[PDB]
């Protein structure tokens, strides 16, 4: 009924004698600069607006009530809050605010700021917030006590409010949450924006009198005096600037770079680990609201034309693994046949499900790697004909109208897109025309949010358990959240996610629910699976030291520090 730490599933790892995380050096020295790259551009400082392209790190301008550890899927520890009292079912919580908590101007962070902040999101925030927290109230019941009440049980929904940025009312009463900010807002975190050039760079400086520098959660972190982001229009120019020493650290997402271009003794450290944790996955989203992709058979046939084995062997040094789950590399992935609990959940909806949900394990198409896979292309032709798209001349045309089968692939100019022309060529050999349109970072963001595309690449970020966030990306009423990439409004999806959001905090029930959802999402071919790898490929100039232990769920760069003895050996 009163705790200092929370976890959505199970018990917090740091529930007892919590002085600092396992993955930090508590004695880490302060000072020095780390310079990072970002791709594309930015035009404002408000991560929470309805429009705009927010600057790098602008989702970390503010401290929150509790903050998550990085070696656990979802555990929360004191930051602005000291502790909380709560009901058994987590449907109400009273949070005690640290009386030392301060904004950057030295003014106190109070319960009224938290109440103001919740109402600000409810009335001027992204439209999914007021949908998720409809019926929730957040009330300052004392100068430093805030009471949160949910209209229905939602342990995760409660805990996720602990991650809300806490806004200073004295600043935000004069700015709509929905408007971009040309200038950084009054904030509170361990780093403050101190200079910038719109579209080019942002410099963060360490707040040397940060009120919380010595909380267990912050010990050994936030060590650099400044963090600089420099923007680059494409990744190849960024990679060449890295090797020239223009910034300090690179996460290598390109197989060819890693295989062939980390050359020149090279002083730069190269590091390949391996994360056994939940994985980000790449997909190509079918906009199923447009006629070209409304037939599941057409989406299946176009998926068959994507020859991953050829690409992996001929282009990518066999580095990649095929995406095949929305819960990739977790126990929630549907990699076995449905068990009895799953069939109880799925059989009621048998007539609105592909039959393969019950009889097969989902397997993205496999080719020989030779190119020109006969079996897969013949099957795509067979499916296209059945859906009414037939060859006249070289071009596939609708059987009744004669309209060509054609669509636009929308692409960020900034990415390496070696796979694109091989895919275009495969589709052309089926009589399908795919136009390629590369656009700038602000165009990509705007059109991705509005779903103004036929197809575009989308990253499905790691999801270690079936979180209530699933409804924002998949459920019918959240269709305009900007996270529903295919545009799907399905009562099958809705029913399974309604069950998932009613099983928050309950692993026993989420286990068959997540697998069941995985089957529905994969077997309907809403998106075309690309690839991932369970390796972190990193390189950095040798000016840093690191704790002995790396956190499970991030790279832990915020635990690194500037090593004056290593830096001294560099030019």
């Amino acid at each position: 009924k009163e705790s200092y730490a929370f976890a959505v599933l199970g018990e917090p790892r740091y529930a007892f004698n919590f002085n600092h995380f396992d993955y930090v050096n508590p004695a880490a020295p302060k000072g020095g600069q780390i310079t990072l790259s970002a791709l594309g551009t930015f035009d404002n400082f408000n991560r929470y607006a309805l429009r705009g392209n927010p600057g790098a790190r602008t989702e970390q301008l503010y401290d929150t009530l509790f903050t998550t550890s990085d070696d656990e899927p979802g555990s929360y520890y004191p930051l602005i809050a000291e502790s909380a009292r709560y009901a058994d079912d987590y449907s109400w919580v009273e949070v005690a605010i640290n009386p030392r908590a301060r904004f950057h101007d030295g003014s106190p962070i109070t319960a009224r700021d938290v109440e103001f902040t919740f109402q600000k999101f409810m009335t001027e925030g992204v439209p999914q917030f007021r949908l998720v927290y409809k019926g929730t109230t957040v009330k300052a019941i004392a100068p430093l006590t805030v009471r949160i009440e949910l209209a229905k049980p939602g342990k995760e929904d409660m805990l996720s409010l602990f991650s809300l940025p806490v806004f200073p009312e004295k600043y935000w009463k004069d700015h709509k949450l929905s408007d971009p900010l040309a200038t950084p807002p009054l904030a509170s975190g361990p780093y403050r924006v101190t200079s910038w050039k719109m579209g080019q760079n942002i410099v963060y400086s360490r707040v040397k009198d940060y009120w919380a520098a010595n909380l267990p959660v912050n010990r050994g972190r936030w060590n650099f005096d400044t963090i600089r982001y420099d923007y680059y229009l494409d990744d190849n120019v960024a990679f060449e600037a890295f090797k020239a020493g223009a910034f300090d650290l690179r996460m290598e997402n390109d197989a060819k770079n890693w295989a062939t271009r980390y050359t020149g003794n090279f002083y730069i450290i190269k590091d390949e680990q391996k994360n056994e944790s939940a994985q980000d996955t790449r997909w190509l989203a079918f906009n199923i609201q447009r006629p070209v992709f409304s037939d599941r058979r057409v989406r299946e046939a176009i998926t068959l034309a994507f020859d991953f084995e050829w690409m992996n062997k001929a282009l990518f040094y066999n580095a990649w693994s095929r995406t095949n789950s929305y819960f990739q590399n977790t126990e929630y992935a549907a990699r076995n046949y449905p068990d009895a609990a799953e069939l109880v959940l799925l059989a009621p909806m048998k007539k609105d499900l592909p039959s393969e949900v019950f009889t097969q394990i989902y397997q993205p198409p496999v080719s020989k790697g030779d190119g020109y896979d006969r079996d897969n292309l013949l099957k795509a032709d067979k499916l296209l004909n059945e859906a009414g798209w037939v060859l006249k001349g070289q071009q596939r045309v609708n059987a009744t109208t004669g309209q060509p089968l054609s669509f636009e692939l929308l692409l960020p100019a900034s990415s390496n897109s070696q796979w694109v022309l091989p895919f275009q060529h495969s589709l052309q050999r089926l009589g399908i025309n795919m136009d390629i349109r590369k656009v700038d970072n602000s165009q990509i963001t705007n059109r991705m949010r509005s779903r103004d595309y036929d197809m575009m690449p989308r990253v499905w970020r790691a999801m270690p358990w079936p979180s209530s966030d699933l409804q924002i990306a998949w459920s019918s009423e959240y269709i305009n959240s900007t996270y529903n990439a295919p545009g799907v409004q399905s009562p099958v999806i809705d029913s399974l996610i309604n069950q998932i959001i009613a099983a928050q905090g309950n692993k026993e029930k989420l286990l068959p629910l997540g697998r069941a959802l995985d089957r529905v999402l994969t077997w309907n071919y809403y998106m075309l699976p690309m690839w991932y790898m369970a390796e972190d490929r990193l390189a950095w100039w040798d000016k840093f030291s690191q704790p002995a232990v790396r956190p499970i769920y991030s790279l832990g760069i915020d635990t690194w520090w500037y090593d004056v003895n290593k830096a001294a050996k560099l030019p």
Partner: peptide, 7 residues
């Protein structure tokens, strides 16, 4: 996803 638009 509840507090900001995709990037």
């Amino acid at each position: 996803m509840r507090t900001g638009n995709a990037x």
